[PDB]
Amino acid sequence: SRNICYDAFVSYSERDAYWVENLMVQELENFNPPFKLCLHKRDFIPGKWIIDNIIDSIEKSHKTVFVLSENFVKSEWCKYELDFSHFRLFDENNDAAILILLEPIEKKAIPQRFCKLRKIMNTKTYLEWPMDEAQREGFWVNLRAAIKS
């Protein structure tokens, strides 16, 4: 494209909308230099259809960041479990996704048909949003690093 490339496409729920659209934006879009972000629930075109929003964004950005939370799982995760051949090499060996764990998630309650997610939860691979405000700096540092890995 012209220069319509983003550093990351960020899928997330409207319930966690504040954290993403304030906290995360300030640490990245306001960073210096800044990151270019495709905010799932802030930059999607109303007209355009659904899959066209998702797929198109994921393809115009270097990475995909999921902001996992109880809510996100129920309301927005499924679409990401079952996927349809739109990655000649599959999202498995395509740089992979960046998972942020916004809050803990009772996996004892996470379906079971959610293979991918469950893996994530065992692999305990993800940036965990620290409850201790004194440790958030390191978090953002990691996040950026990840988005630029």
Short mmCIF file of N, CA, C and O in Angstrom, two decimals:
data_model
loop_
_atom_site.label_atom_id
_atom_site.label_comp_id
_atom_site.label_asym_id
_atom_site.label_seq_id
_atom_site.Cartn_x
_atom_site.Cartn_y
_atom_site.Cartn_z
N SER A 1 0.85 -1.23 0.00
CA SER A 1 0.00 0.00 0.00
C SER A 1 0.87 1.26 0.00
O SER A 1 2.10 1.17 -0.05
N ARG A 2 0.22 2.42 0.05
CA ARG A 2 0.93 3.70 0.08
C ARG A 2 1.90 3.70 1.26
O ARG A 2 3.12 3.71 1.09
N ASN A 3 1.32 3.71 2.46
CA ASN A 3 2.08 3.69 3.71
C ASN A 3 1.03 3.38 4.76
O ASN A 3 1.09 3.86 5.89
N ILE A 4 0.06 2.56 4.36
CA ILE A 4 -1.04 2.15 5.22
C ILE A 4 -0.66 0.91 6.02
O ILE A 4 -1.42 -0.06 6.08
N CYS A 5 0.53 0.94 6.62
CA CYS A 5 1.03 -0.16 7.43
C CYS A 5 1.01 0.22 8.90
O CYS A 5 1.49 1.29 9.28
N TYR A 6 0.47 -0.66 9.74
CA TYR A 6 0.42 -0.39 11.16
C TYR A 6 1.41 -1.29 11.88
O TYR A 6 1.82 -2.32 11.34
N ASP A 7 1.78 -0.91 13.10
CA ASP A 7 2.70 -1.73 13.87
C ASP A 7 1.93 -2.89 14.45
O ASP A 7 2.41 -4.02 14.50
N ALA A 8 0.70 -2.62 14.86
CA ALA A 8 -0.13 -3.66 15.41
C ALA A 8 -1.61 -3.34 15.26
O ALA A 8 -2.01 -2.19 15.24
N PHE A 9 -2.40 -4.40 15.13
CA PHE A 9 -3.84 -4.28 15.06
C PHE A 9 -4.18 -4.77 16.46
O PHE A 9 -3.66 -5.80 16.91
N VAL A 10 -5.04 -4.05 17.16
CA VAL A 10 -5.36 -4.44 18.51
C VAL A 10 -6.80 -4.83 18.71
O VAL A 10 -7.67 -3.96 18.81
N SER A 11 -7.08 -6.12 18.80
CA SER A 11 -8.44 -6.55 19.04
C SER A 11 -8.66 -6.50 20.55
O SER A 11 -7.76 -6.82 21.33
N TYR A 12 -9.87 -6.10 20.94
CA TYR A 12 -10.23 -5.99 22.35
C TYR A 12 -11.74 -5.73 22.50
O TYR A 12 -12.42 -5.43 21.53
N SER A 13 -12.26 -5.86 23.71
CA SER A 13 -13.68 -5.63 23.92
C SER A 13 -13.96 -4.17 24.29
O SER A 13 -13.07 -3.43 24.71
N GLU A 14 -15.22 -3.75 24.15
CA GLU A 14 -15.58 -2.38 24.48
C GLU A 14 -15.56 -2.19 25.99
O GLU A 14 -15.50 -1.07 26.48
N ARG A 15 -15.59 -3.28 26.74
CA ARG A 15 -15.57 -3.16 28.19
C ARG A 15 -14.17 -2.80 28.67
O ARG A 15 -14.01 -2.19 29.74
N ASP A 16 -13.15 -3.18 27.90
CA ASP A 16 -11.78 -2.86 28.28
C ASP A 16 -11.34 -1.66 27.45
O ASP A 16 -10.18 -1.24 27.48
N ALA A 17 -12.29 -1.11 26.70
CA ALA A 17 -12.03 0.01 25.83
C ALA A 17 -11.22 1.15 26.45
O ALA A 17 -10.34 1.72 25.80
N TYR A 18 -11.49 1.49 27.70
CA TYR A 18 -10.77 2.60 28.30
C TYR A 18 -9.28 2.33 28.39
O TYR A 18 -8.46 3.10 27.89
N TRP A 19 -8.91 1.24 29.04
CA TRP A 19 -7.51 0.87 29.19
C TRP A 19 -6.77 0.95 27.86
O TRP A 19 -5.69 1.55 27.76
N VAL A 20 -7.35 0.36 26.82
CA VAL A 20 -6.72 0.36 25.51
C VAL A 20 -6.64 1.74 24.85
O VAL A 20 -5.59 2.14 24.34
N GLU A 21 -7.76 2.45 24.88
CA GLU A 21 -7.85 3.74 24.23
C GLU A 21 -7.28 4.92 24.99
O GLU A 21 -7.26 6.03 24.49
N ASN A 22 -6.81 4.68 26.20
CA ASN A 22 -6.20 5.72 27.00
C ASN A 22 -4.83 5.24 27.40
O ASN A 22 -3.82 5.64 26.82
N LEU A 23 -4.80 4.35 28.38
CA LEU A 23 -3.55 3.79 28.87
C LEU A 23 -2.59 3.32 27.75
O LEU A 23 -1.44 3.77 27.68
N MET A 24 -3.04 2.43 26.88
CA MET A 24 -2.16 1.91 25.83
C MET A 24 -1.78 2.90 24.75
O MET A 24 -0.67 2.89 24.23
N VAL A 25 -2.72 3.75 24.39
CA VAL A 25 -2.45 4.72 23.36
C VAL A 25 -1.37 5.70 23.84
O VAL A 25 -0.43 5.98 23.11
N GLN A 26 -1.51 6.19 25.07
CA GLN A 26 -0.54 7.14 25.61
C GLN A 26 0.89 6.59 25.65
O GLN A 26 1.85 7.33 25.47
N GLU A 27 1.03 5.29 25.89
CA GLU A 27 2.34 4.68 25.96
C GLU A 27 2.91 4.30 24.60
O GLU A 27 4.09 3.96 24.50
N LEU A 28 2.09 4.34 23.55
CA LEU A 28 2.58 3.97 22.22
C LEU A 28 2.37 5.03 21.15
O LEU A 28 3.33 5.47 20.52
N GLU A 29 1.13 5.44 20.92
CA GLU A 29 0.84 6.47 19.93
C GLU A 29 1.44 7.78 20.41
O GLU A 29 1.74 8.66 19.61
N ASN A 30 1.61 7.91 21.71
CA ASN A 30 2.19 9.12 22.27
C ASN A 30 3.66 8.91 22.57
O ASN A 30 4.33 9.79 23.09
N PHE A 31 4.15 7.73 22.24
CA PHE A 31 5.55 7.42 22.46
C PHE A 31 6.36 8.24 21.46
O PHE A 31 5.78 8.87 20.57
N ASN A 32 7.68 8.24 21.59
CA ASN A 32 8.53 8.99 20.67
C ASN A 32 9.84 8.29 20.33
O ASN A 32 10.72 8.15 21.18
N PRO A 33 9.97 7.82 19.09
CA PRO A 33 8.94 7.94 18.05
C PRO A 33 7.67 7.19 18.46
O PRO A 33 7.69 6.42 19.42
N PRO A 34 6.56 7.41 17.74
CA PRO A 34 5.30 6.73 18.07
C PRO A 34 5.02 5.48 17.24
O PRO A 34 5.63 5.27 16.19
N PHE A 35 4.09 4.66 17.72
CA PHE A 35 3.68 3.45 17.02
C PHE A 35 2.42 3.84 16.27
O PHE A 35 1.74 4.79 16.65
N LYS A 36 2.11 3.10 15.20
CA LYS A 36 0.90 3.35 14.42
C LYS A 36 -0.02 2.18 14.76
O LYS A 36 0.32 1.02 14.53
N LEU A 37 -1.19 2.48 15.33
CA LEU A 37 -2.10 1.41 15.74
C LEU A 37 -3.47 1.37 15.10
O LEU A 37 -4.13 2.39 14.94
N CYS A 38 -3.91 0.16 14.76
CA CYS A 38 -5.24 -0.06 14.20
C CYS A 38 -6.10 -0.56 15.36
O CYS A 38 -6.16 -1.75 15.64
N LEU A 39 -6.75 0.36 16.06
CA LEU A 39 -7.58 0.01 17.20
C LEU A 39 -8.91 -0.61 16.80
O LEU A 39 -9.83 0.09 16.38
N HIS A 40 -9.00 -1.92 16.95
CA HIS A 40 -10.20 -2.69 16.62
C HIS A 40 -11.52 -1.95 16.83
O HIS A 40 -12.33 -1.86 15.91
N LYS A 41 -11.74 -1.40 18.02
CA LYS A 41 -12.99 -0.70 18.28
C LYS A 41 -12.90 0.81 18.33
O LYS A 41 -13.53 1.44 19.16
N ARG A 42 -12.12 1.39 17.42
CA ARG A 42 -11.96 2.84 17.35
C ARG A 42 -11.64 3.26 15.93
O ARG A 42 -11.89 4.40 15.54
N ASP A 43 -11.08 2.35 15.14
CA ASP A 43 -10.74 2.69 13.78
C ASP A 43 -11.46 1.88 12.72
O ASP A 43 -11.16 2.02 11.54
N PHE A 44 -12.39 1.02 13.12
CA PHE A 44 -13.12 0.24 12.13
C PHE A 44 -14.11 1.14 11.42
O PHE A 44 -14.75 1.98 12.06
N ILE A 45 -14.21 0.96 10.11
CA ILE A 45 -15.14 1.75 9.30
C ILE A 45 -16.54 1.20 9.49
O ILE A 45 -16.78 0.00 9.32
N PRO A 46 -17.49 2.07 9.86
CA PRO A 46 -18.88 1.67 10.09
C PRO A 46 -19.48 0.92 8.90
O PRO A 46 -19.97 -0.21 9.04
N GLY A 47 -19.43 1.56 7.73
CA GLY A 47 -19.96 0.95 6.53
C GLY A 47 -19.43 -0.45 6.30
O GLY A 47 -20.17 -1.44 6.45
N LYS A 48 -18.16 -0.54 5.94
CA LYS A 48 -17.50 -1.82 5.66
C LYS A 48 -18.06 -2.95 6.53
O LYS A 48 -18.50 -2.72 7.65
N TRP A 49 -18.07 -4.16 5.98
CA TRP A 49 -18.57 -5.32 6.69
C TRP A 49 -17.64 -5.78 7.80
O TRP A 49 -16.57 -5.22 8.01
N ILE A 50 -18.06 -6.84 8.48
CA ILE A 50 -17.30 -7.39 9.59
C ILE A 50 -15.95 -7.99 9.19
O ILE A 50 -14.91 -7.35 9.34
N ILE A 51 -15.97 -9.22 8.67
CA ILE A 51 -14.75 -9.91 8.28
C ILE A 51 -13.83 -9.01 7.48
O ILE A 51 -12.61 -9.16 7.53
N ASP A 52 -14.41 -8.07 6.75
CA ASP A 52 -13.61 -7.16 5.95
C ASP A 52 -12.83 -6.22 6.86
O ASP A 52 -11.73 -5.78 6.51
N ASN A 53 -13.39 -5.92 8.03
CA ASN A 53 -12.72 -5.05 8.98
C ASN A 53 -11.56 -5.83 9.59
O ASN A 53 -10.40 -5.44 9.47
N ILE A 54 -11.90 -6.93 10.25
CA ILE A 54 -10.90 -7.77 10.88
C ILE A 54 -9.78 -8.16 9.91
O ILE A 54 -8.70 -7.57 9.93
N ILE A 55 -10.05 -9.13 9.04
CA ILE A 55 -9.06 -9.59 8.08
C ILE A 55 -8.25 -8.45 7.46
O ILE A 55 -7.02 -8.50 7.47
N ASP A 56 -8.91 -7.43 6.92
CA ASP A 56 -8.17 -6.34 6.30
C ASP A 56 -7.18 -5.65 7.22
O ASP A 56 -6.08 -5.29 6.80
N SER A 57 -7.56 -5.44 8.48
CA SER A 57 -6.67 -4.80 9.44
C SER A 57 -5.47 -5.70 9.73
O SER A 57 -4.32 -5.30 9.58
N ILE A 58 -5.76 -6.93 10.16
CA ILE A 58 -4.73 -7.91 10.46
C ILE A 58 -3.69 -7.99 9.34
O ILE A 58 -2.52 -8.21 9.59
N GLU A 59 -4.13 -7.79 8.10
CA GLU A 59 -3.21 -7.86 6.98
C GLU A 59 -2.45 -6.56 6.71
O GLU A 59 -1.45 -6.56 5.98
N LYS A 60 -2.91 -5.45 7.27
CA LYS A 60 -2.23 -4.18 7.04
C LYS A 60 -1.34 -3.78 8.22
O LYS A 60 -0.76 -2.69 8.23
N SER A 61 -1.22 -4.68 9.19
CA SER A 61 -0.40 -4.40 10.36
C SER A 61 0.57 -5.54 10.66
O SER A 61 0.21 -6.71 10.56
N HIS A 62 1.81 -5.18 11.03
CA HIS A 62 2.86 -6.15 11.34
C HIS A 62 2.51 -7.16 12.43
O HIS A 62 2.94 -8.31 12.36
N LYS A 63 1.75 -6.74 13.43
CA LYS A 63 1.38 -7.65 14.51
C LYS A 63 -0.04 -7.49 15.01
O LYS A 63 -0.69 -6.47 14.78
N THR A 64 -0.52 -8.51 15.70
CA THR A 64 -1.87 -8.49 16.23
C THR A 64 -1.82 -8.72 17.72
O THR A 64 -1.33 -9.73 18.20
N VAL A 65 -2.36 -7.75 18.46
CA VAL A 65 -2.37 -7.80 19.91
C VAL A 65 -3.76 -8.06 20.46
O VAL A 65 -4.68 -7.30 20.19
N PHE A 66 -3.89 -9.11 21.25
CA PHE A 66 -5.18 -9.40 21.85
C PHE A 66 -5.15 -8.99 23.32
O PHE A 66 -4.23 -9.35 24.06
N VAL A 67 -6.14 -8.23 23.76
CA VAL A 67 -6.18 -7.82 25.15
C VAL A 67 -7.15 -8.75 25.87
O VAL A 67 -8.32 -8.44 26.04
N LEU A 68 -6.65 -9.90 26.29
CA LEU A 68 -7.44 -10.92 26.98
C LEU A 68 -7.97 -10.49 28.33
O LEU A 68 -7.25 -9.91 29.14
N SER A 69 -9.23 -10.81 28.58
CA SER A 69 -9.90 -10.50 29.84
C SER A 69 -11.09 -11.44 29.92
O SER A 69 -11.42 -12.08 28.92
N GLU A 70 -11.73 -11.53 31.08
CA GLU A 70 -12.89 -12.41 31.17
C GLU A 70 -13.78 -12.03 30.00
O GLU A 70 -13.98 -12.83 29.07
N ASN A 71 -14.28 -10.80 30.01
CA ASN A 71 -15.15 -10.31 28.95
C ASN A 71 -14.67 -10.59 27.51
O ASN A 71 -15.42 -11.16 26.71
N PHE A 72 -13.44 -10.21 27.18
CA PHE A 72 -12.96 -10.43 25.82
C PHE A 72 -13.18 -11.85 25.34
O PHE A 72 -13.64 -12.08 24.22
N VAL A 73 -12.84 -12.80 26.20
CA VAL A 73 -12.98 -14.21 25.88
C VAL A 73 -14.40 -14.55 25.42
O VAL A 73 -14.59 -15.00 24.29
N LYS A 74 -15.38 -14.31 26.29
CA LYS A 74 -16.77 -14.60 25.96
C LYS A 74 -17.26 -13.89 24.68
O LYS A 74 -17.71 -14.54 23.72
N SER A 75 -17.15 -12.57 24.66
CA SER A 75 -17.60 -11.76 23.53
C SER A 75 -16.79 -11.70 22.25
O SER A 75 -17.38 -11.59 21.17
N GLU A 76 -15.47 -11.78 22.31
CA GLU A 76 -14.73 -11.66 21.06
C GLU A 76 -13.72 -12.74 20.70
O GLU A 76 -13.15 -12.70 19.61
N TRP A 77 -13.50 -13.71 21.58
CA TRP A 77 -12.49 -14.72 21.27
C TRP A 77 -12.78 -15.72 20.15
O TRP A 77 -11.94 -15.89 19.25
N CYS A 78 -13.94 -16.38 20.20
CA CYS A 78 -14.30 -17.40 19.20
C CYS A 78 -13.85 -17.15 17.76
O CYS A 78 -13.25 -18.02 17.13
N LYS A 79 -14.15 -15.98 17.24
CA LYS A 79 -13.76 -15.66 15.87
C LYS A 79 -12.30 -16.06 15.65
O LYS A 79 -11.92 -16.49 14.56
N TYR A 80 -11.49 -15.93 16.70
CA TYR A 80 -10.07 -16.24 16.59
C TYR A 80 -9.72 -17.71 16.79
O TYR A 80 -8.62 -18.13 16.41
N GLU A 81 -10.63 -18.48 17.37
CA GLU A 81 -10.37 -19.90 17.53
C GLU A 81 -10.49 -20.50 16.13
O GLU A 81 -9.48 -20.82 15.50
N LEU A 82 -11.72 -20.64 15.64
CA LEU A 82 -11.97 -21.17 14.30
C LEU A 82 -11.54 -20.12 13.30
O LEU A 82 -12.02 -18.99 13.36
N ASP A 83 -10.64 -20.47 12.40
CA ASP A 83 -10.16 -19.52 11.39
C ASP A 83 -10.27 -20.14 10.01
O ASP A 83 -10.41 -21.35 9.90
N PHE A 84 -10.23 -19.31 8.96
CA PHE A 84 -10.33 -19.83 7.59
C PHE A 84 -9.24 -19.42 6.60
O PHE A 84 -9.19 -18.27 6.15
N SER A 85 -8.40 -20.41 6.25
CA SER A 85 -7.26 -20.29 5.33
C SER A 85 -7.03 -18.94 4.65
O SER A 85 -7.29 -18.79 3.46
N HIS A 86 -6.52 -17.98 5.42
CA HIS A 86 -6.24 -16.65 4.91
C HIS A 86 -4.78 -16.30 5.22
O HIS A 86 -4.36 -15.14 5.16
N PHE A 87 -4.02 -17.33 5.57
CA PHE A 87 -2.61 -17.23 5.90
C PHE A 87 -1.95 -18.46 5.28
O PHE A 87 -1.97 -19.55 5.87
N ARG A 88 -1.41 -18.28 4.08
CA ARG A 88 -0.77 -19.36 3.35
C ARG A 88 0.16 -20.19 4.22
O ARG A 88 0.46 -21.34 3.91
N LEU A 89 0.61 -19.60 5.33
CA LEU A 89 1.50 -20.29 6.25
C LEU A 89 0.85 -20.47 7.62
O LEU A 89 1.46 -21.01 8.54
N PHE A 90 -0.38 -19.99 7.75
CA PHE A 90 -1.14 -20.09 8.99
C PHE A 90 -0.56 -19.22 10.10
O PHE A 90 0.66 -19.16 10.28
N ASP A 91 -1.44 -18.55 10.84
CA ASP A 91 -1.04 -17.68 11.94
C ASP A 91 -0.08 -18.33 12.93
O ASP A 91 0.47 -17.65 13.80
N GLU A 92 0.12 -19.63 12.80
CA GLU A 92 1.02 -20.36 13.69
C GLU A 92 2.48 -20.00 13.42
O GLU A 92 3.25 -19.72 14.34
N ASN A 93 2.86 -20.01 12.14
CA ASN A 93 4.22 -19.67 11.75
C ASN A 93 4.25 -18.37 10.95
O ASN A 93 4.94 -18.25 9.93
N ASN A 94 3.48 -17.39 11.42
CA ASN A 94 3.39 -16.07 10.79
C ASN A 94 3.67 -15.00 11.84
O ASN A 94 2.82 -14.15 12.11
N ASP A 95 4.86 -15.04 12.44
CA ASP A 95 5.28 -14.08 13.48
C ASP A 95 4.55 -14.29 14.80
O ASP A 95 5.09 -13.97 15.87
N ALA A 96 3.33 -14.81 14.73
CA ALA A 96 2.50 -15.06 15.90
C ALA A 96 1.86 -13.78 16.46
O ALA A 96 2.17 -12.66 16.04
N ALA A 97 0.96 -13.97 17.41
CA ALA A 97 0.25 -12.88 18.03
C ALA A 97 0.90 -12.48 19.34
O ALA A 97 1.67 -13.24 19.92
N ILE A 98 0.57 -11.28 19.81
CA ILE A 98 1.06 -10.74 21.06
C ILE A 98 -0.13 -10.74 22.02
O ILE A 98 -1.09 -10.01 21.82
N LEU A 99 -0.09 -11.55 23.06
CA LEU A 99 -1.21 -11.60 23.98
C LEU A 99 -0.97 -10.86 25.29
O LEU A 99 0.01 -11.09 25.97
N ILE A 100 -1.88 -9.96 25.61
CA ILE A 100 -1.80 -9.20 26.84
C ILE A 100 -2.86 -9.78 27.75
O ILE A 100 -3.99 -9.99 27.31
N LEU A 101 -2.51 -10.04 29.00
CA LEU A 101 -3.48 -10.56 29.95
C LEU A 101 -3.85 -9.41 30.86
O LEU A 101 -3.11 -9.08 31.78
N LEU A 102 -4.99 -8.79 30.59
CA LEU A 102 -5.44 -7.63 31.35
C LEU A 102 -5.85 -7.94 32.78
O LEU A 102 -5.67 -7.13 33.69
N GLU A 103 -6.43 -9.11 32.98
CA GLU A 103 -6.86 -9.56 34.30
C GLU A 103 -6.74 -11.06 34.30
O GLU A 103 -6.61 -11.69 33.24
N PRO A 104 -6.79 -11.68 35.47
CA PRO A 104 -6.69 -13.14 35.47
C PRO A 104 -7.92 -13.72 34.78
O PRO A 104 -8.94 -13.05 34.61
N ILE A 105 -7.82 -14.98 34.37
CA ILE A 105 -8.93 -15.65 33.70
C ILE A 105 -9.06 -17.08 34.21
O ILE A 105 -8.16 -17.89 34.02
N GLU A 106 -10.19 -17.37 34.85
CA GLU A 106 -10.47 -18.71 35.37
C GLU A 106 -10.54 -19.64 34.16
O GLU A 106 -11.55 -19.68 33.48
N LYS A 107 -9.48 -20.38 33.90
CA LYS A 107 -9.49 -21.27 32.75
C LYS A 107 -10.28 -22.54 33.03
O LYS A 107 -10.65 -23.27 32.11
N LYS A 108 -10.54 -22.80 34.31
CA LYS A 108 -11.31 -23.98 34.69
C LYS A 108 -12.66 -23.80 34.04
O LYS A 108 -13.38 -24.76 33.78
N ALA A 109 -13.00 -22.54 33.78
CA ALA A 109 -14.27 -22.19 33.17
C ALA A 109 -14.15 -21.92 31.68
O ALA A 109 -15.17 -21.75 31.00
N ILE A 110 -12.94 -21.87 31.15
CA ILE A 110 -12.78 -21.62 29.72
C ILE A 110 -13.20 -22.88 28.99
O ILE A 110 -12.55 -23.92 29.11
N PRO A 111 -14.28 -22.80 28.20
CA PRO A 111 -14.80 -23.93 27.44
C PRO A 111 -13.95 -25.19 27.46
O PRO A 111 -13.89 -25.90 28.48
N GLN A 112 -13.29 -25.48 26.35
CA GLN A 112 -12.47 -26.67 26.21
C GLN A 112 -12.29 -26.80 24.72
O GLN A 112 -11.31 -27.35 24.23
N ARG A 113 -13.28 -26.29 23.99
CA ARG A 113 -13.26 -26.31 22.54
C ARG A 113 -12.33 -25.19 22.09
O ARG A 113 -11.97 -25.10 20.91
N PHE A 114 -11.96 -24.32 23.03
CA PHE A 114 -11.04 -23.22 22.78
C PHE A 114 -9.61 -23.73 22.88
O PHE A 114 -8.87 -23.36 23.79
N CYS A 115 -9.22 -24.60 21.95
CA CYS A 115 -7.88 -25.16 21.94
C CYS A 115 -6.84 -24.07 22.03
O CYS A 115 -6.12 -23.95 23.03
N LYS A 116 -6.75 -23.26 20.98
CA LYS A 116 -5.77 -22.19 20.94
C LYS A 116 -5.64 -21.43 22.24
O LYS A 116 -4.55 -21.34 22.81
N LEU A 117 -6.75 -20.89 22.72
CA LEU A 117 -6.72 -20.11 23.94
C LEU A 117 -6.13 -20.91 25.08
O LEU A 117 -5.18 -20.46 25.72
N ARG A 118 -6.69 -22.08 25.35
CA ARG A 118 -6.20 -22.92 26.43
C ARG A 118 -4.70 -23.12 26.34
O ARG A 118 -4.01 -23.07 27.36
N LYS A 119 -4.19 -23.36 25.13
CA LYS A 119 -2.74 -23.52 24.95
C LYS A 119 -2.10 -22.29 25.58
O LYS A 119 -1.31 -22.40 26.52
N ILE A 120 -2.47 -21.13 25.07
CA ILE A 120 -1.97 -19.85 25.57
C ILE A 120 -1.90 -19.85 27.09
O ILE A 120 -0.87 -19.56 27.68
N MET A 121 -3.02 -20.17 27.72
CA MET A 121 -3.12 -20.19 29.17
C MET A 121 -2.14 -21.14 29.87
O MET A 121 -1.71 -20.86 30.99
N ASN A 122 -1.80 -22.25 29.23
CA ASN A 122 -0.85 -23.19 29.82
C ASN A 122 0.55 -22.67 29.53
O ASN A 122 1.38 -22.53 30.43
N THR A 123 0.80 -22.37 28.26
CA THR A 123 2.08 -21.84 27.82
C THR A 123 2.46 -20.62 28.65
O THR A 123 3.60 -20.16 28.62
N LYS A 124 1.49 -20.10 29.40
CA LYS A 124 1.72 -18.91 30.21
C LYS A 124 2.68 -17.99 29.47
O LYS A 124 3.76 -17.63 29.95
N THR A 125 2.27 -17.64 28.25
CA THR A 125 3.02 -16.74 27.39
C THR A 125 2.11 -15.56 27.16
O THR A 125 1.06 -15.70 26.53
N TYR A 126 2.51 -14.40 27.68
CA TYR A 126 1.72 -13.20 27.52
C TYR A 126 2.18 -12.16 28.50
O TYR A 126 2.72 -12.48 29.54
N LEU A 127 1.95 -10.91 28.16
CA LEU A 127 2.33 -9.84 29.03
C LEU A 127 1.20 -9.72 30.05
O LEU A 127 0.04 -9.54 29.69
N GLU A 128 1.54 -9.86 31.32
CA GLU A 128 0.52 -9.78 32.36
C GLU A 128 0.42 -8.42 33.00
O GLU A 128 1.33 -7.99 33.71
N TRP A 129 -0.70 -7.74 32.77
CA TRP A 129 -0.92 -6.41 33.34
C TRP A 129 -0.76 -6.43 34.86
O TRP A 129 -1.62 -6.91 35.59
N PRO A 130 0.36 -5.87 35.36
CA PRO A 130 0.64 -5.83 36.79
C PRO A 130 -0.35 -5.06 37.67
O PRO A 130 -0.75 -3.94 37.35
N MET A 131 -0.74 -5.68 38.78
CA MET A 131 -1.64 -5.02 39.70
C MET A 131 -0.90 -3.94 40.45
O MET A 131 -1.48 -2.93 40.83
N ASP A 132 0.39 -4.16 40.66
CA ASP A 132 1.24 -3.20 41.36
C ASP A 132 1.65 -2.09 40.40
O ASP A 132 2.48 -2.31 39.52
N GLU A 133 1.09 -0.90 40.59
CA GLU A 133 1.37 0.23 39.72
C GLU A 133 2.84 0.56 39.56
O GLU A 133 3.24 1.20 38.59
N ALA A 134 3.65 0.09 40.50
CA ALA A 134 5.08 0.34 40.44
C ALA A 134 5.78 -0.52 39.41
O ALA A 134 6.94 -0.31 39.10
N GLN A 135 5.06 -1.50 38.86
CA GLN A 135 5.66 -2.39 37.88
C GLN A 135 5.12 -2.25 36.45
O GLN A 135 5.48 -3.02 35.56
N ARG A 136 4.29 -1.25 36.22
CA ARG A 136 3.72 -1.04 34.91
C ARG A 136 4.72 -0.50 33.90
O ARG A 136 4.65 -0.80 32.71
N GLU A 137 5.68 0.28 34.37
CA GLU A 137 6.69 0.81 33.47
C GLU A 137 7.28 -0.36 32.70
O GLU A 137 7.24 -0.40 31.47
N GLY A 138 7.81 -1.33 33.43
CA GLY A 138 8.41 -2.49 32.79
C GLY A 138 7.48 -3.13 31.79
O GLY A 138 7.91 -3.60 30.74
N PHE A 139 6.19 -3.14 32.13
CA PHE A 139 5.18 -3.73 31.26
C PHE A 139 5.18 -3.08 29.89
O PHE A 139 5.33 -3.76 28.88
N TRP A 140 5.01 -1.76 29.86
CA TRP A 140 4.99 -1.02 28.60
C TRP A 140 6.29 -1.27 27.82
O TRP A 140 6.27 -1.44 26.60
N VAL A 141 7.40 -1.29 28.54
CA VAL A 141 8.69 -1.54 27.91
C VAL A 141 8.57 -2.89 27.19
O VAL A 141 8.87 -2.99 26.00
N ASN A 142 8.11 -3.92 27.89
CA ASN A 142 7.97 -5.21 27.26
C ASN A 142 7.05 -5.11 26.06
O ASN A 142 7.43 -5.52 24.96
N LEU A 143 5.84 -4.58 26.26
CA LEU A 143 4.88 -4.46 25.16
C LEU A 143 5.51 -3.92 23.88
O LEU A 143 5.46 -4.57 22.85
N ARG A 144 6.10 -2.73 23.96
CA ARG A 144 6.73 -2.12 22.78
C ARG A 144 7.71 -3.09 22.17
O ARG A 144 7.67 -3.37 20.97
N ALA A 145 8.60 -3.61 23.01
CA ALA A 145 9.59 -4.57 22.55
C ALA A 145 8.89 -5.65 21.74
O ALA A 145 9.29 -5.97 20.63
N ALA A 146 7.84 -6.21 22.30
CA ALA A 146 7.09 -7.25 21.63
C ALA A 146 6.55 -6.77 20.28
O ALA A 146 6.76 -7.41 19.26
N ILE A 147 5.84 -5.64 20.28
CA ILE A 147 5.28 -5.12 19.05
C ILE A 147 6.36 -4.83 18.02
O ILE A 147 6.08 -4.77 16.82
N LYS A 148 7.60 -4.66 18.46
CA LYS A 148 8.70 -4.40 17.54
C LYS A 148 9.67 -5.58 17.41
O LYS A 148 10.75 -5.44 16.84
N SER A 149 9.29 -6.74 17.93
CA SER A 149 10.15 -7.91 17.87
C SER A 149 10.20 -8.45 16.45
O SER A 149 9.52 -7.87 15.59
#
